[PDB]
Write an enzyme that holds these catalytic residues in place. Structure first.
Site, PDB file in Angstrom:
ATOM      1  N   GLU A  44       0.857  -1.012  -0.040  1.00 54.37           N
ATOM      2  CA  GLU A  44      -0.031   0.016  -0.183  1.00 54.37           C
ATOM      3  C   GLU A  44       0.893   1.279   0.058  1.00 54.37           C
ATOM      4  OE1 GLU A  44      -2.890   0.195  -0.889  1.00 54.37           O
ATOM      5  OE2 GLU A  44      -3.997  -1.551  -0.303  1.00 54.37           O
ATOM      6  N   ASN A  86      -7.544   8.485  -5.956  1.00 54.86           N
ATOM      7  CA  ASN A  86      -8.310   7.782  -6.476  1.00 54.86           C
ATOM      8  C   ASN A  86      -9.008   8.485  -7.813  1.00 54.86           C
ATOM      9  OD1 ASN A  86      -7.517   5.804  -4.523  1.00 54.86           O
ATOM     10  ND2 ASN A  86      -8.901   6.703  -3.268  1.00 54.86           N
ATOM     11  N   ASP A 139     -12.189   8.418  -8.412  1.00 57.11           N
ATOM     12  CA  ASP A 139     -13.310   9.014  -8.198  1.00 57.11           C
ATOM     13  C   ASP A 139     -13.139  10.513  -7.264  1.00 57.11           C
ATOM     14  OD1 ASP A 139     -12.717   8.249  -5.555  1.00 57.11           O
ATOM     15  OD2 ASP A 139     -14.266   7.037  -5.262  1.00 57.11           O
ATOM     16  N   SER A 181     -11.676  10.590  -4.289  1.00 56.48           N
ATOM     17  CA  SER A 181     -11.403  10.657  -3.121  1.00 56.48           C
ATOM     18  C   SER A 181      -9.572  10.237  -2.917  1.00 56.48           C
ATOM     19  CB  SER A 181     -11.973   9.366  -2.541  1.00 56.48           C
ATOM     20  OG  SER A 181     -11.628   7.994  -3.488  1.00 56.48           O
ATOM     21  N   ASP A 202      -6.444   8.213  -0.725  1.00 57.68           N
ATOM     22  CA  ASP A 202      -5.845   7.169   0.287  1.00 57.68           C
ATOM     23  C   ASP A 202      -4.660   7.787   1.103  1.00 57.68           C
ATOM     24  OD1 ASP A 202      -7.687   5.370  -0.820  1.00 57.68           O
ATOM     25  OD2 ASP A 202      -6.216   4.112  -1.831  1.00 57.68           O
ATOM     26  N   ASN A 254      -9.049   5.159   2.788  1.00 58.14           N
ATOM     27  CA  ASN A 254      -9.842   5.990   1.553  1.00 58.14           C
ATOM     28  C   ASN A 254     -10.722   7.147   2.421  1.00 58.14           C
ATOM     29  OD1 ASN A 254     -11.304   4.869  -1.423  1.00 58.14           O
ATOM     30  ND2 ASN A 254     -11.154   6.968  -0.487  1.00 58.14           N
TER      31      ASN A 254
HETATM   32 RH   LIG Z   1     -10.879   3.401  -7.315  1.00 56.13          RH
END
Ligand SMILES: [Rh+3]
Ligand SMILES: [Cl-]
Ligand SMILES: [Cl-]
Ligand SMILES: [Cl-]
Ligand code: NA
Ligand SMILES: [Rh+3]
Ligand SMILES: [Rh+3]
Ligand SMILES: [Rh+3]
Ligand SMILES: [Rh+3]
Ligand SMILES: [Rh+3]
Length: 129
Positions: A35, A46, A48, A50, A52, A59
């Site tokens: 990660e 991300n 969309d 968002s 992380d 997220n």
């Molecule tokens: Rh995604």
């Protein structure tokens, strides 16, 4: 902070992740490796919109507030910046909520694709735990 492998294993153990929801410590270390490469300051946007955050790439869509993820929730009741601290407490506590939500560690796509079903014990080999 970029943790050493065993250093992170030790911190995760102290904070109660070893066998949490049935996932051995090696699962958590493997997840962090892929990660974030053990870097608490890791962030990734991300598709969309968002983001992380942190060692376990938690997220903003569901788990923390970053003020820029429309319609999102803050289920861990924390600013996303708390997840970037050298102290992993906030990430661990939030991770415990995520892994308890029904899907287990499948919530972490890199765990599913890179750790699940592998010899995860290798990730804690050599550590004084
Ligand atoms: Rh995604
Ligand atoms: Cl393990
Ligand atoms: Cl938001
Ligand atoms: Cl499970
Ligand atoms: Na959010
Ligand atoms: Rh153990
Ligand atoms: Rh705030
Ligand atoms: Rh502390
Ligand atoms: Rh600590
Ligand atoms: Rh082995």
């Amino acid at each position: 902070k970029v943790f050493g492998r065993c250093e992170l294993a030790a911190a995760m153990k102290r904070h109660g992740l070893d066998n949490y929801r049935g996932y051995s410590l090696g699962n958590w270390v493997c997840a962090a490796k892929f990660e974030s490469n053990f870097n608490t300051q890791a962030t990734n946007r991300n598709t969309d919109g968002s983001t992380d955050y942190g060692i376990l790439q938690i997220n903003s869509r569901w788990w923390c507030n970053d003020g820029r993820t429309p319609g999102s929730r803050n289920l861990c009741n924390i600013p996303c910046s708390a997840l970037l601290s050298s102290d992993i407490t906030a990430s661990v506590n939030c991770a415990k909520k995520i892994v308890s939500d029904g899907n287990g560690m499948n919530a972490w796509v890199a765990w599913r694709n890179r750790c699940k079903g592998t010899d995860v014990q290798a990730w804690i080999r050599g550590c004084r735990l």
